[PDB]
C-alpha cells in the first residue's frame, strides 16, 4: 500500500555498452560511481547545470521500477513532489499500448485524463512543462524509431505507437520533454533513437529501515508482524534476499497463508526458487491433479515466447484448460480476473516467468536453447530454470508431480554449456549460478573465476559473491574496501570488493554467515571498513564455527573498541586454524590488550603472527604481554610499533623475552624515544639470542 522507500543510484557514466571488456582495473571501479539520491531530486540539476532530459530506471526483476513512477505521479496529484516544474504528468504503459495499433496524441491525452480534459493547444504550447511516465519499454517487442524524422504528424492522426513514442523521444514532438523511462536490461541504443546523454538511475530494493517498515506495514495485528520479523531475521539468507520487494511480498504472503487457519511458521527456504516452490505448495494444498499445472506452465511459456502476458480465452482451450481448471486457479490465486471483458492473465510477470521455467523441465525429459526466454543471465527465467535443477530445487516438484524426474544429470549436462558460456564472468551470472546451491555443480562451472575485482552493491549480491567465490579454487585472498581508500595489489589471487554506497549494520552480518563450509579461501581481508559491536559479535560467532577454516585474519583500521576485544578473544578459544591476527592502526587500551593476553598465553590458539601497530598501548599492559611471551608456545612474530611504550614497558617485555620458552623470532619495537642504556640492553639481549631480530621503519 504505502510506498516503502527504495535506494536509487545516480551513476554519472553512460551504461550503453562495454564491448571492450573491462581493460584497466581502475577504470572498472571508476565506472560504478553510486551517488545515492532521494525521490525529490530525480529531475534535479545534477553535477553540472545541464538538467537531464531522459531518466532511465534499471534494476532486476520485480525490483520496483513499476511502482516508483506511480508513486511519483500520485504524490504530485496530492502535491508533494515537483509542483513547480511539471504542469501536467501523463501515465502510460508500453504493455497496455502494445495491444492497440491505432493511437495518436489526442487519443493518448484522452486515455490518460488524470484531470478534466484540457484543450490540446495550450498543452502543446508549453514544452518544458510536461512529464511522461512509462512502465517498461522492454515489455513489448517495439522498436521505438521515428520514420525518416524531418517531419511531425498532427495530433488525432492515426499512427502506430512504435513510431509515435520514438518520435516523442527523438526530439520531434514536444522536444524539451522529461521522460521517466524504466528498463530491465541495459544496451538501449538499438531501442532508443540517439539516446546519447541520459541519467542512468539504478533501482535498488528495500534496506533495513525500509524492510522494517514494510514488514511492519503488511499485517493488522502487531504480534503477527513481530513473529514474522523474528523468523525472517532468524533465516539470514531470507534477510539477504528480501531486498527485492517481490521477495518480501512473497514471504509475507506465505507467512499469512501459513498463519491463516492453524500452522506454525517454518521457512527453511534460502533462495528465491525454493520460496516460490513453497508458495506454490501452499497454494496447491493436496490437489493430486498434476497435468493441469503442466498445461498452465506450457501456456505461460507460449505467452512469454510471443511477448504475451494477457492470455486470450481461446488460447486457454488449445492448451487443454477448461472452465473448471480456470475456476480452481482463480480460487487458489495463481490467476486473476480484471474488470475487463473476457480475458485472463497472471498476477505478476515474475510468476509468468516462473511458470514458463517449469514447462521446459517438464517437457525436456546452451544459450541457443534459451532463445524462447532470451537474455543470457539477464533474465530471471534462466535463474529459476537453473535453480529448479538443484538437489533442493528437484525436491519439492516431486511432491506436486508424481513423476520421479532426472536425478542431477539434467544439471550435469548443463555444466559444459554454462562453462562454455561463462568466460565473461559477471554479477548476474553469479546470481544465476548461486541459484544452483550445489557443491557438485559449483566446482567446475566457477573454477575459472580468474577475475581481479568487481563491484558489490547489495546484501544479496554480497552473499552471492561470497558463496560463489568460496566455491572455487584459485582464490585465496578476499578483500573488502570502502573504495575511496582504494589500495590493493594485482595478485591473481586477489579479489577486490569495493562499495561506494553507505550501508546499515547488515553488510557484515550477512557476510559472516556465509563463511560456513569455507573452501580454500582461508585468508580474509576487511581492513579500512568501519564495523560495530554486533558485527564483531557475528564475526566471533563465525570464528566459533567448528567447520570454519580461517587461517589468517586482518582487522586493520576498523575503529575497534575495547569491549569487542573480549568477544574476539573469547571467539578465538573455539578455533585451531587461525595463525595470523592483524590489529594495526586500531584503537585499543590496556584492558583491551589484557583480554588478548589472557587467551594468547593458553597452550591452544596457535597464533603464529600478531600485529599491534598504533594500538595506543602503554607500559601498563607490558606485564601481561611479557607473561604471554613467557607462557605461549605458538607466538612466532609479534609487532608493537607506533606505541608510546616508554622504558618500563620495554624492560617488562625484555623480562618476558629473556625466558628460554619464548618462541618469538622477529619483533617490532620503537627505539627512537628510548634512553641511552635501553639500546645497550636490547643489543645485549639480541646478542644472547641469535634467533631474535628487532626491526623498525627502515
Amino acid at each position: 500500500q504505502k510506498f516503502t522507500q527504495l535506494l536509487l543510484l545516480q551513476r554519472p557514466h553512460p551504461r550503453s555498452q562495454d564491448p571492450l571488456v573491462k581493460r584497466s582495473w581502475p577504470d572498472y571501479v571508476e565506472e560504478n560511481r553510486g551517488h545515492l539520491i532521494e525521490i525529490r531530486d530525480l529531475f534535479g540539476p545534477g553535477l553540472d547545470t545541464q538538467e537531464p532530459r531522459i531518466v532511465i530506471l534499471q534494476g532486476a526483476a520485480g525490483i520496483g521500477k513499476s511502482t516508483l513512477a506511480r508513486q511519483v505521479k500520485e504524490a504530485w496529484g496530492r502535491g508533494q513532489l515537483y509542483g513547480d516544474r511539471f504542469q501536467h504528468v501523463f501515465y502510460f504503459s508500453c504493455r497496455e499500448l502494445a495491444q492497440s495499433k491505432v493511437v495518436s496524441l489526442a487519443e493518448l491525452i484522452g486515455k490518460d485524463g488524470t484531470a478534466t480534459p484540457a484543450p490540446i493547444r495550450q498543452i502543446l504550447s508549453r514544452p518544458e512543462r510536461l512529464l511522461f511516465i512509462l512502465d517498461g519499454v522492454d515489455e513489448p517487442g517495439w522498436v521505438l524509431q521515428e520514420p525518416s524524422s524531418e517531419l511531425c504528424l498532427h495530433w488525432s492522426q492515426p499512427q502506430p505507437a512504435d513510431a509515435l513514442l520514438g518520435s516523442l523521444l527523438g526530439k520531434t514532438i514536444l522536444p524539451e520533454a522529461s521522460f521517466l523511462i524504466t528498463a530491465r536490461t541495459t544496451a538501449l541504443q538499438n531501442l532508443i533513437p540517439s539516446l546519447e546523454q541520459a541519467r542512468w538511475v539504478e533501482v535498488l530494493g528495500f534496506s533495513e529501515s525500509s524492510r522494517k517498515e514494510y514488514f511492519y506495514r503488511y499485517f493488522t495485528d502487531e504480534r503477527q508482524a513481530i513473529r514474522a520479523f523474528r523468523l525472517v531475521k532468524s533465516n539470514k539468507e531470507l534477510w539477504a534476499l528480501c531486498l527485492v520487494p517481490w521477495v518480501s511480498w512473497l514471504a509475507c504472503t506465505c507467512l499469512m497463508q501459513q498463519m491463516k487457519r492453524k500452522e506454525k511458521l517454518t521457512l527453511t527456504s534460502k533462495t528465491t526458487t525454493t520460496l516460490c516452490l513453497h508458495y506454490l505448495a501452499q497454494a496447491l494444498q493436496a490437489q493430486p491433479l498434476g497435468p493441469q499445472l503442466r498445461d498452465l506452465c506450457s501456456l505461460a511459456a507460449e505467452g512469454i515466447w510471443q511477448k504475451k502476458t494477457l492470455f486470450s480465452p481461446d488460447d486457454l482451450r488449445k492448451h487443454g484448460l477448461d472452465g473448471a481448471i480456470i475456476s480452481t486457479f482463480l480460487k487458489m490465486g495463481i490467476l486473476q480476473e480484471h474488470p475487463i471483458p473476457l480475458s485472463y492473465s497472471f498476477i505478476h510477470l515474475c510468476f509468468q516467468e516462473f511458470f514458463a521455467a517449469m514447462s521446459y523441465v517438464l517437457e525436456d525429459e546452451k544459450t541457443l536453447e534459451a532463445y524462447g526466454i532470451h537474455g543470457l543471465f539477464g533474465a530471471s527465467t534462466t535463474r529459476f530454470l537453473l535453480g529448479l535443477l538443484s538437489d533442493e530445487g528437484e525436491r519439492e516438484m516431486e511432491n506436486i508431480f508424481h513423476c520421479r524426474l532426472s536425478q542431477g544429470r539434467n544439471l550435469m549436462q548443463w555444466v559444459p554449456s554454462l562453462q562454455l558460456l561463462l568466460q565473461p564472468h559477471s554479477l548476474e551470472s553469479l546470481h544465476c549460478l548461486y541459484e544452483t546451491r550445489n557443491k557438485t555443480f559449483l566446482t567446475q562451472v566457477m573454477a575459472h573465476f580468474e577475475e581481479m575485482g568487481m563491484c558489490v552493491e547489495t546484501d544479496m549480491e554480497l552473499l552471492v559473491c561470497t558463496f560463489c567465490i568460496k566455491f572455487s579454487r584459485h582464490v585465496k585472498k578476499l578483500q573488502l574496501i570502502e573504495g575511496r581508500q582504494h589500495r590493493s595489489t594485482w595478485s591473481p589471487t586477489m579479489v577486490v570488493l569495493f562499495r561506494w554506497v553507505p550501508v546499515t549494520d547488515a553488510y557484515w552480518q550477512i557476510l559472516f554467515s556465509v563463511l560456513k563450509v569455507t573452501r580454500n579461501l582461508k585468508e580474509l581481508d576487511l581492513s579500512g571498513n568501519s564495523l560495530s559491536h554486533s558485527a564483531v559479535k557475528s564475526l566471533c560467532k563465525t570464528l566459533r564455527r567448528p567447520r570454519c577454516l580461517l587461517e589468517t585474519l586482518r582487522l586493520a583500521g576498523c575503529g575497534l573498541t575495547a569491549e569487542d576485544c573480549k568477544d574476539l578473544a573469547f571467539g578465538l578459544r573455539a578455533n585451531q586454524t587461525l595463525t595470523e591476527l592483524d590489529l594495526s592502526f586500531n584503537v585499543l587500551t590496556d584492558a583491551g590488550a589484557k583480554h588478548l593476553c589472557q587467551r594468547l598465553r593458553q597452550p591452544s590458539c596457535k597464533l603464529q603472527r600478531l600485529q599491534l601497530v598504533s594500538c595506543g598501548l602503554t607500559s601498563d599492559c607490558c606485564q601481561d604481554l611479557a607473561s604471554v611471551l613467557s607462557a605461549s608456545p605458538s607466538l612466532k612474530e609479534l609487532d608493537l610499533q607506533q606505541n608510546n611504550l616508554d622504558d618500563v614497558g620495554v624492560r617488562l617485555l625484555c623480562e618476558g623475552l629473556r625466558h628460554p620458552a619464548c618462541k618469538l623470532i622477529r619483533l617490532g619495537l620503537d627505539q627512537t624515544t628510548l634512553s641511552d642504556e635501553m639500546r645497550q640492553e636490547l643489543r645485549a639481549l639480541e646478542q644472547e639470542k641469535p634467533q631474535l631480530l628487532i626491526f623498525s621503519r627502515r
Binding site: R121, L124, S125, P127, S149, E150, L151, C152, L153, H154, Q157, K171, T172, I173, L174, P175
Partner: protein, 106 residues
C-alpha cells in the same frame, strides 16, 4: 520578412495584395521542431529576394480552419500559390529542395 495570418480574411487579403509576386504559405507549430529550425532559413531567403517572393506564416493551432481548407496534416509544409491559385505544395524541412522549388517557381 514573414507575415503572420490570424484568420481567413487576412489570408485572402494578403493573397489579393500580393499581385504577381510568388506566394509561399508555411504551416508551422510551436511544438514542432523542424518547423522552427527551418523558419529562420525561410525568413533569410525572403529577406534576400523580397522583391519577388512573399512568405506567410500561419499557425495550425490558431488557424485550424485554414489547415482544414488547404487539407494538410503533416508539418512543416510549404504551399506555393500563383495568381491566387495553388501551383505546388510539399511537406518536409528539406532546405535545399524548398530553395530549388522557390527558384523554379520565381
Amino acid at each position: 520578412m514573414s507575415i503572420h495570418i490570424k484568420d481567413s480574411d487576412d489570408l485572402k487579403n494578403r493573397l489579393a495584395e500580393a499581385g504577381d509576386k510568388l506566394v509561399v504559405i508555411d504551416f508551422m507549430a510551436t511544438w514542432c521542431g523542424p518547423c522552427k529550425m527551418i523558419g529562420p532559413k525561410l525568413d533569410e531567403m525572403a529577406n534576400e529576394m523580397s522583391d519577388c517572393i512573399v512568405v506567410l506564416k500561419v499557425d495550425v493551432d490558431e488557424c485550424e480552419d485554414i489547415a482544414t481548407e488547404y487539407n494538410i496534416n503533416s508539418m512543416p509544409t510549404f504551399v506555393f500559390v500563383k495568381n491566387s491559385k495553388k501551383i505546388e505544395e510539399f511537406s518536409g524541412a528539406n532546405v535545399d529542395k524548398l530553395r530549388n522549388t522557390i527558384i523554379k517557381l520565381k
